[PDB]
DNA sequence: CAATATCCCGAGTACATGCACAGGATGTATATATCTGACACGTGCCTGGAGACTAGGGAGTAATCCCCTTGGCGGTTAAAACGCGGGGGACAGCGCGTACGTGCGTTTAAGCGGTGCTAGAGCTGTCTACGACCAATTGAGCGGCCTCGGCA
């Protein structure tokens, strides 16, 4: 019980790391969506919404 | 008519294929399971219908010459065919990676309770952007003034 610190702010990102995990699991994916692979995927989505 | 070529038919030709075999891993088979979602029930919305009217557009025509279309153009190479060069083709082996097996232990999923992030709320509450209109500018064409070249 020490408050909470969202996975977005821990990563350094403005896109929602939690929401995207829960979207990847229950996509047409196989049965194991590692958590470090929702951070290298909020990033390589937010990067277009900068570069575009 | 002559000639190069494609077509056609039979001999002779390795191996490819279809098969039989051993055997192993998985498809079946039964019992159990909850829960997906089927189904049933209303909720409330928009999809649709249905009218009146302007004004924008659409259709039409008319005139016409631009552009396409055609013929005939003159100019130069891809094709034809040959000579001619080297290069794609067929064997000997090394060991390095790939696989595969072993035991490597990292992380996720789940179920837990707490809580703050977000996404529907407003007439929010305005005021960027949206017309509406004005004004400037350039460019083009038409008059008008003025030296000089070819003709009496």
Curated annotation (Swiss-Prot):
Species: Homo sapiens
This protein's record includes keyword tRNA processing: no
Alphabetically ordered keywords of this record: Acetylation, Chromosome, DNA-binding, Isopeptide bond, Methylation, Nucleosome core, Nucleus, Ubl conjugation
UniProt modified residues of type N6-acetyllysine: 1
GO molecular function: chromatin DNA binding; nucleosomal DNA binding; protein heterodimerization activity; RNA polymerase II cis-regulatory region sequence-specific DNA binding; RNA polymerase II core promoter sequence-specific DNA binding; structural constituent of chromatin
Function: Variant histone H2A which replaces conventional H2A in a subset of nucleosomes. Nucleosomes wrap and compact DNA into chromatin, limiting DNA accessibility to the cellular machineries which require DNA as a template. Histones thereby play a central role in transcription regulation, DNA repair, DNA replication and chromosomal stability. DNA accessibility is regulated via a complex set of post-translational modifications of histones, also called histone code, and nucleosome remodeling. May be involved in the formation of constitutive heterochromatin.
Name of the gene: H2AZ1
Principal cellular location given in the protein's record: nucleus
PTM per Swiss-Prot/TrEMBL: Acetylation by the NuA4 histone acetyltransferase complex is required for hematopoietic stem cell maintenance. Not phosphorylated.
Entry's localization field: Nucleus; Chromosome
UniProt modified residues of type N6-lactoyllysine: 1
Coiled coil: none
Family affiliation: Belongs to the histone H2A family.
UniProt keyword annotation of Repeat present: no
Name recorded for this polypeptide: Histone H2A.Z
GO biological process: cellular response to estradiol stimulus; chromatin organization; heterochromatin formation; positive regulation of transcription by RNA polymerase II
Quaternary structure and partners: The nucleosome is a histone octamer containing two molecules each of H2A, H2B, H3 and H4 assembled in one H3-H4 heterotetramer and two H2A-H2B heterodimers. The octamer wraps approximately 147 bp of DNA. H2A or its variant H2AZ1 forms a heterodimer with H2B. H2AZ1 interacts with INCENP. Interacts (via M6 cassette) with ANP32E; leading to removal of H2A.Z/H2AZ1 from the nucleosome. Heterodimer H2BC11 and H2AZ1 interacts with VPS72 (via N-terminal domain). The interaction of HZAZ1 and VPS72 is enhanced by VPS72 phosphorylation which is promoted by ZNHIT1. Interacts with PWWP2A.
Lineage: Eukaryota, Metazoa, Chordata, Craniata, Vertebrata
A GO CC term assigned to this protein in UniProt: nucleus
Portion of the full-length sequence here: 14 to 65 of 128
């Amino acid at each position: 019980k020490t408050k909470a610190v969202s996975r977005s702010q821990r990563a350094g990102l403005q896109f929602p790391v939690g929401r995207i995990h829960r979207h990847l699991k229950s996509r047409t994916t196989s049965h194991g969506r590692v958590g470090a692979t929702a951070a290298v995927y909020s990033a390589a989505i937010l990067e277009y919404l900068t570069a575009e």
